[PDB]
Subunit: 334 residues, 4 copies
């Protein structure tokens, strides 16, 4: 009884969500909407990927439909989201991934198209936010349109939840060394809003401001007003690492932190929070489905009330898998 | 008696043309037009450069004008090129560098604005093409709108002229390993027209097609229909190298080729064609004003009628200096 | 009846040969010799790879032996190759991959250790050279020590053989845009022999001289003295492309060249020479086992007697697979 | 009355120290010792630089001596430091920059060669440590052999001194995003001691451990046992940024921190500690002689007792200038 899923927008997040859905098999993709991309271009884009390699399967175009592993997918090219006939294709859930419809009113334009529930793959100002393994038990069948927050937030939230539940975080500051994204540009370029983001991505570091640590307090209400930070954008393909410096109420040696993190990674947070002790680097976490992997050897502790923790997280993947897992849990709650 | 120069578009070519004009002092910039960039953003963009470093001088904004080294520059923000009041600012020549007005009819929209002559910093379908040091003596004061072809063409043309004048090129194929440009994109991305150009610039090589070697036959009429080739786009900041494989009529040892190239580089083509024998790499030619520099040690010769020549050329700079030199020669012919 | 294979040196070529042998299953690895690497370091090096990703299997160390997929491997740490007890481990063939024993006299030091035949994974001055699919039928059971030439040579030889057999290459010049290797260095550095190779690999192009096209005439005797060229070293992880500019005796349109290349790629040279018509880039050929893949859209033809051909080849892989295939053919001839 | 300076080792630090000494003109270089580099190779290495560009001056070799700007320099090629005739060349101070003679006993081998005082351009276990602008007034003419600590330490120490003097740092954790160095290697490689450092520098982030924040407590005795941290090695040419997260005794808004940092940067710490408010990136600090530049817009403050500060520092340069400034102050104290 897999739910029917339509995808709005065939960008990096939409293609990776489709790839993760076909690899895991938890949900079924029946419809893809993109107005600027024709069918053969979507075949070429889904077939070849520079970062994650070639697709393991058969993808082609026939009868005006995108056939992936023998499964036909109806293609729409409507710019206005209110005109898309989601109910004609039979799609029950709709993943909004264009990044321009983030408010509840804008994302509610899929409702008159025949869609039941809309999941936004972006942070939202007013839609409820859910992170798998942290607060996903708060979801109700009354929540038609929700949000999966952001990848960084998805990296920070389970580790922060475990550390706050075991030792009581007083306050913390987070720094995330981030890989390059589609919004950056080569050889400098223009960028009215953010002047730093318009510089050349290949030759620079480029500090930036983010609100993921502030969104952690939205996801976990006890940590509201205790977490904030910034980011660096280094020229890496698809690996980012989160660094969290925090102060704790109860004394905690580094071995106790490692023990409780490994214990949480084994049972309750299996598949979400990872644990390792090897001498790993960034490219060892390519195409990893974990939301975050705790690095035991990388972190350092100044004292029992002042520590610093390091976590690896894949930007492209992982989140897509959390979107698929959230849709599966939503279908299970139906 | 320096000529007054206005610049349309403040992109990479326009900023570098302004920088080269202020460094050399041959011409004077009195007007800059760009509709999407405000004045403080142009101050920030001209002040800081990721590739060529900080500007050697004083740049600021005062009284709604851009003051560079004590020289005020009037700023226009007109999208339609026919509405720009070039004659009000006193600009005599206009450098069209936006890359969207390449035909004679489109570039003639600056004529009713009060401009006398328009120089296009791009290849053109119907405007006459001039390369400094090769065919710039063919220019007439009757030529209001002309073109400076392309940088690659500007790299290939003097070396090909010298080799054809000394040994009689029968036919040749050219390959140019090119640095990244503003049209490429990080982390793959979309590109309807050219599907290869939409892939990730950081992780790929990306073969491409170019018409610079075909434009050499337009500049040099005796070589028409004898030169064609392609290109590779490697992730380099701003250095490209041209490789030319050719067949000659008269026998020519490699020492004779080196001798005639050094002799041509010394006298007639001083400052345009360079010559070196050191063990150089690409970053040794950063901020070099030469159109092309012949690498003696890099090339190889199969036999006296079949050789391969290597030339280094800076993409960002050099061309801008050739635009400034062409404008100076145009003002001298007046 | 798989042959027993020992590997001398656990560098990039030795590890990739072991990986290809365990993936294909044609031969069996029973012994690895390296004096500078301890056992746990070899476990860590074989387990994690930055370019080709994690190993698909189980690798561990037990009883002083390297266990890969349940197969134990004896480990030697002898610096002098004459003291290695190859016959004690039961290894019949020995792959010499350290790159310092390339002559016949130096590579013959494995013979008194109990090894029967020695295969050098490097170009050799006096050992016979064999390329799979080109001249591998010339091998005799009298040839104990031979060579597999080089990867570039392995890329160039089948395409050149097909083009020479169909159209009669008169002469040709080859340029190969190469990825970075272990001999290069970051942030410049020292390099007495080659001054260009000591410069910084990340920021430069670095022309270099190679003898692969000269070695093609050693492999194919009819093309002796007709092929020579050079190379460029761009900062790419593991993808290189070969560009060959050639003159032909019989007239040949580009469609006929594409037809004969596709026909040769289908039947006789299946798995060695590849053919494609898609808009591919370098990272599309990551972990590809083909020796060379002909790019139909990338090449250009000046005329029926003057053409330019483009081929993609993986530096790390492919060659390792050709070493494994050559050892399998050698065992079949026994 | 400039002091005579000899340099041991012509690596990256020695060449940059010579370049900074010839650019500033505070000291005079009379002798260079390197056993593995011949004279023409040093001419080529000093003439061309991939990061900082070509040398602004004349460098050549004549009469077995290195002539820079008309100044001859005697060249030694002695491996054993005790055999170098420093007193024959007239050198009074000796800069030890090979990185293998860091103890007092090993660096004292230059004393019987005729040298008076030895300055180590590396952290030392037992030699006294001096940072310019922080504790350089503690130096005595009784200190023949001393140390200039490390560049990171030189970046962190003035900012930490200002913040501790104004607001009383309780404890702090430091993270520094570092550019690539000569010890890293391309395409992975071997690294017995540190397994993470042997991975490929181009494709990875590579966490590492450093003792610069622990050395700050050695330089500033009041901060002993209050500062520790780690590092990340991203593939950048020559720009690194320091991030310091700290807790303060007295309340401090971000505007007060900016005011006291700007006031300290203007008067007492002119030329050592920099201040900026522009939207800068890493490549804007290329060839900057400041030890550290405070970034006002990049940092963030959680509350009045918990802040995070960002500072930019050039790895190659700056330190070399601090070595030259320390030698000038040492000569002034004589």
């Amino acid at each position: 009884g897999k739910v029917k899923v339509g995808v709005n927008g065939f960008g990096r997040i939409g293609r990776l969500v489709t790839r993760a859905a076909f690899n895991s098999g938890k949900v079924d993709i029946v419809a893809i909407n993109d107005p600027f991309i024709d069918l053969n271009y979507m075949v070429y884009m889904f077939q070849y990927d520079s970062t994650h390699g070639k697709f393991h399967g058969t993808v082609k175009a026939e009868n005006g439909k995108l056939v992936i592993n023998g499964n036909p997918i109806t293609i729409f090219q409507e710019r206005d989201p209110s005109k898309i006939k989601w109910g004609d294709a039979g799609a029950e859930y709709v993943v909004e991934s264009t990044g321009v419809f983030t408010t509840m009113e804008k994302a509610g334009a899929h409702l008159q198209g025949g869609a039941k529930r809309v999941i936004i793959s972006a942070p939202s100002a007013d839609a409820p936010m859910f992170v798998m393994g942290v607060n996903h038990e708060k979801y109700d069948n009354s929540l038609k349109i929700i949000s999966n927050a952001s990848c960084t937030t998805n990296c920070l939230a389970p580790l922060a939840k475990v550390i706050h539940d075991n030792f009581g975080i007083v306050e913390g500051l987070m720094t995330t060394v981030h890989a390059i994204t589609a919004t950056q540009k080569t050889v400098d370029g223009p960028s009215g809003k953010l002047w730093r983001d318009g510089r050349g991505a290949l030759q620079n570091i480029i500090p930036a401001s983010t609100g993921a640590a502030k969104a952690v307090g939205k996801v976990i209400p006890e940590l509201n007003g205790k977490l904030t930070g910034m980011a660096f954008r280094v020229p890496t393909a698809n690996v980012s690492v989160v660094d969290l410096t925090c102060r704790l109420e109860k004394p905690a040696k580094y071995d106790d932190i490692k023990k409780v993190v490994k214990q949480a990674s084994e049972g309750p947070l299996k598949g979400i929070l990872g644990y390792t002790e090897h001498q790993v680097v960034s490219s060892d976490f390519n195409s990893d489905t974990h939301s975050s992997t705790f690095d035991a050897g990388a972190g350092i502790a100044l004292n029992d009330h002042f520590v610093k923790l390091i976590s690896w997280y894949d930007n492209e993947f992982g989140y897509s898998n959390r979107v698929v897992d959230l849709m599966a849990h939503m279908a299970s709650k139906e």
